[PDB]
């Protein structure tokens, strides 16, 4: 939902037919080439389309325009849905489009390959094996007398 659109800065290039720009002000926000954008599909029930703004230009025939380089989610691939709803995939699908179709400005980052990391065990909760329930870890404290051999499980069960 975008209704008030204004160019930012002088035109970077001119076709004599198109006037390319580097930044746009849409409503409150400022959008520039390279930013990413969300678009509602024709079927509103479908998830948001996401794209990278590769160009911005004013057209004598079409008006205020931009070029959308789409991303895609796992459901759009042979994979099916992915484990993370924030996961996207690059894909070679493009589209010229009106700026008024932009739903919102979104943040898309590239996550570079990473290593295995510190493979150590961890815990977060305490399991009451009698009542089959999880709680925050109990804060049973040792004394200065039995600290050298304190077992928090020995203390509670006593």
């Amino acid at each position: 939902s975008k209704n008030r659109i204004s160019w930012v800065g002088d035109a970077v290039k001119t076709d004599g037919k198109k006037s390319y720009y580097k930044k746009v002000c849409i409503d409150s926000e400022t959008l520039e080439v390279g930013d990413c954008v969300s678009v509602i599909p024709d079927d509103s029930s479908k998830p948001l389309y996401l794209a990278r703004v590769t160009a911005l230009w004013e057209d004598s025939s079409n008006g205020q325009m931009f070029h959308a380089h789409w991303f895609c989610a796992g459901t759009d691939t042979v994979l099916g849905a992915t484990s993370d709803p924030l996961e996207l995939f690059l894909v070679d699908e493009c589209e010229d489009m009106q700026l008024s179709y932009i739903h919102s400005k979104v943040q898309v980052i590239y996550k570079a390959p990473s290593g295995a990391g510190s493979a150590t065990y961890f815990y977060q909760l305490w399991y009451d094996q009698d009542y089959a329930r999880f709680e925050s870890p109990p804060k049973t404290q040792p004394t200065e007398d039995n600290k050298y051999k304190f077992c928090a499980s020995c203390a509670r069960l006593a």
Binding site: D42, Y49, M97
Partner: peptide, 7 residues
């Protein structure tokens, strides 16, 4: 192929 065909 083109995705959005709205008007």
């Amino acid at each position: 192929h083109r995705k959005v065909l709205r008007d």
